[PDB]
């Protein structure tokens, strides 16, 4: 009944020293029924990464919508969109459906190409921006992620330290949520390389 917990799943994003990380589980379900273990929730437009939790049809629709908008942006602007700019585009796009919203939990992650500054952000379904430097969480195990992140996180972690932190935050949160898990992906993002790692986890 509740659109934001029909399909299930989670996203978490973190900042480190000259890097960011974003991670998600791979589950798609119809309430109790597991349907897919290959439903990735993180997308990218140039060097800006967007995770989306919630109703899966809206996840897919919004990905397609932001690909559309960032493609036109690039053609007109003659440059790739930056995380700060994209964050505002997401907020605007969500709020224009104020009274018929998309049931989603977006998370932005990326490094500004000019300043080199790591950036992460989050939004509510109607676009309010959560702009926090440490970490952003979203999905049906958001409470669990808040708990993991608050106790595991510390600032200025090196890329490979940050990988371990975000992975353990995701995995252990997902295992306390019926509607999350079935695999997991972690992106480690630096100024000019991105590493994508699939994690081994329990499949129940």
Partner 1 sequence: TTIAGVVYKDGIVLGADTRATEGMVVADKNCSKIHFISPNIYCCGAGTAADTDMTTQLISSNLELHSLSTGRLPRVVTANRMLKQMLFRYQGYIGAALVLGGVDVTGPHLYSIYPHGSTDKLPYVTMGSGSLAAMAVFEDKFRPDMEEEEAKNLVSEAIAAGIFNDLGSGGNIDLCVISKNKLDFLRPYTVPNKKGTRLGRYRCEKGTTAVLTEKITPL
Partner 2 sequence: QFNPYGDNGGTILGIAGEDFAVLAGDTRNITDYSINSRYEPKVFDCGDNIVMSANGFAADGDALVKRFKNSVKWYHFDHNDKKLSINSAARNIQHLLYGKRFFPYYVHTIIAGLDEDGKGAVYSFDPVGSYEREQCRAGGAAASLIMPFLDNQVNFKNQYEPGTNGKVKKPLKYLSVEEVIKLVRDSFTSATERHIQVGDGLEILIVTKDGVRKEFYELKRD
Partner 3 sequence: MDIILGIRVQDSVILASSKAVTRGISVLKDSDDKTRQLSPHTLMSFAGEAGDTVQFAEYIQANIQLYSIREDYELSPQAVSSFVRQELAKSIRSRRPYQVNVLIGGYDKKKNKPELYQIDYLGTKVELPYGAHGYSGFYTFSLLDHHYRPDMTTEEGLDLLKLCVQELEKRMPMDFKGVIVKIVDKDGIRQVDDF
Beta sheet of 48-54, edge-to-edge order:
42-45, 48-54, 104-111, 118-123, 129-130
| Residues sharing a CB contact under 8 Å with residue 88, sequence separation 6 or more, in sequence order | none
Measured between alpha carbons, how far apart are the two ends of the chain, in Å?
Answer: 23
30 is in the binding site of which of partner 2, partner 3, partner 1, none (Cβ under 5 to 8 A by kind)?
A: partner 3
The span of 12-20, 33-41, 56-64, 126-134 binding partner 1 (CB under 8 A) equals 126-134
Binding-residue pattern over the window 44 to 83 for partner 3, x denoting contact by CB under 8 A: -----------xxx--xx----------------------
Residue where the block lists tokens 């109703």: 55
Residue linked to tokens 């991670």: 23
Q: Examine residue 96 and tell whether it contacts partner 2 (CB under 8 A).
A: no
Give 78: exposed, middle or buried? Use CB within 10 Å, 0-12, 13-18, 19+: exposed
CB atoms within 10 A of CB 60: 13
Span 161-190, contacts to Mg ion by CB under 5 A: 181
Choose one: 14-22, 24-32, 34-42, 122-130; the region binding partner 1 (CB under 8 A): 122-130
Selected from 155, 193, 203, 204, the binder of partner 1 by CB under 8 A is 193
Diameter of the chain by CA atoms?
47
Q: Closest CB to partner 3 among 71 and 168?
A: 71
Residues in contact with Mg ion by CB under 5 A are 181, 204
Residues in contact with partner 2 by CB under 8 A are 143-144, 146-148, 150-152, 168, 171-173, 175-176, 200-201
């Amino acid at each position: 009944s509740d659109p934001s917990s029909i399909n299930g799943g989670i996203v978490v994003a973190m900042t480190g020293k000259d890097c960011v990380a974003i991670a998600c589980d791979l589950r798609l379900g119809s309430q109790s029924l597991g349907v897919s273990n290959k439903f990735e929730k993180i997308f990218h437009y140039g060097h800006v990464f967007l995770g989306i939790t919630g109703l899966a049809t809206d996840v897919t629709t919004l990905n397609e919508m932001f690909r559309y908008k960032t493609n036109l942006y690039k053609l007109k602007e003659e440059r790739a969109i930056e995380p700060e700019t994209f964050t505002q585009l997401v907020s605007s796009s969500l709020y224009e459906r104020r009274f018929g919203p998309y049931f989603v939990g977006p998370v932005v992650a990326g490094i500004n190409s000019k300043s080199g500054k790591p950036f992460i952000a989050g939004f509510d379904l109607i676009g309010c921006i959560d702009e926090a430097k440490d970490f952003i969480v979203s999905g049906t195990a958001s409470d669990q992620l808040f708990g993991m992140c608050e106790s595991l996180y510390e600032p200025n972690l090196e890329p490979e330290d940050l990988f371990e932190t975000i992975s353990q935050a995701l995995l252990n949160a997902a295992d306390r949520d019926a509607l999350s898990g079935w695999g997991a992906v972690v992106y480690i993002i630096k100024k000019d390389e991105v590493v994508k790692r699939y994690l081994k986890m329990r499949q129940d």
